[PDB]
Design a binder for this molecule. Structure first.
Ligand code: 7X1
Length: 253
């Protein structure tokens, strides 16, 4: 896919499941240089590493991480994506706690919902939608990546392993809560089993401090026990668009 000579690996910036994550530069003939993130890498594990790229490579949308390419005819094996300067959304928000406006946070959430709308339209169920799996660029554009997390997972998906775009809608509601809380951990220190039991017994997370009531009600809609009752992602995006166009709605807390 990509000639290794076109890749310049700079600073190590993270650790992933199979190895390091680096910042670097991609420069192909006829194209301007671009800034990339690079994951560097068993066989079964090699196919497990590269599977992320083949899934990612199916997609083209401004809120889904762009695959720039792979290095697989050389070693180390590599996956290159567009560089997302602010990294993962949960830790980015914790660093900036209280420092973005409600309208900014809704804009982030709208971008995440558009991504998910596109995945669902493609019949792709994510199963691992969480703030930690969303990356943020220098213009605050949020992009879904990562291609059972109990506290993010719908009760029917936990109980019956039934994963659908409607179980992703449940997870999206949890991401809304993460965002509006500036990256707090869902259900704080409750154990996984306590979370399962609480949800089955009708507990739902409360509105984060300063959270508009209209956003918390959207979270509650996403967390309906009946999966058919949850909003689909087009309705989620349209709900956020209405809130953005009519921002007075976001003042009631
Ligand atoms: C782990 O930090 C970053 C990961 C990024 C990333 N990850 C990624 C995924 Cl999720 C999936 C496949 C990939 C891949 O890289 C190449 O192949 N992709 C793109 N950009 C990333 C940026 C990352 O961190 C940016 C540095 C953030 N840092 C700035 C200084 C203060 C702390 C946060």
């Amino acid at each position: 896919e990509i000639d290794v000579s076109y890749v310049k690996i700079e600073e190590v910036i993270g650790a992933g499941e199979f190895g390091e994550v680096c910042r670097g530069r991609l420069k192909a003939p006829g194209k301007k240089e671009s800034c990339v993130a690079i994951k560097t890498l068993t066989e079964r594990q090699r196919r497990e590493f590269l599977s992320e790229a083949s899934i990612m490579g199916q997609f083209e949308h401004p809120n889904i991480i762009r695959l720039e390419g792979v290095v697989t005819n050389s070693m180390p094996v590599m996956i290159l994506t567009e560089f997302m300067e602010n990294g993962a959304l949960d830790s980015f928000l914790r660093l900036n706690d209280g420092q973005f406006t409600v309208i900014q946070l809704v804009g982030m959430l709208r971008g995440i919902a558009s991504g998910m709308r596109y995945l669902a339209e493609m019949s792709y169920v994510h199963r691992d939608l969480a703030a930690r799996n969303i990356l943020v660029n220098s213009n605050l554009v949020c992009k879904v990546s990562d291609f059972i997390p109990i506290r993010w997972t719908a009760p029917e998906a936990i109980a019956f392993r039934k994963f659908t775009s409607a179980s992703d809608a449940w997870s999206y509601g949890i991401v809304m809560w993460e965002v509006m809380s500036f990256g707090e951990r869902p259900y704080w220190d409750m154990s996984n089993q306590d979370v399962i039991n609480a949800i089955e017994q009708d507990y739902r997370l409360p509105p984060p401090p300063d959270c508009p009531t209209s956003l918390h009600q959207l979270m509650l809609d996403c967390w309906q026990k009946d999966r058919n009752a949850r909003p689909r992602f087009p309705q989620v995006v349209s709900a956020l668009d209405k809130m953005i166009r009519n921002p007075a709605s976001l003042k009631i807390v």
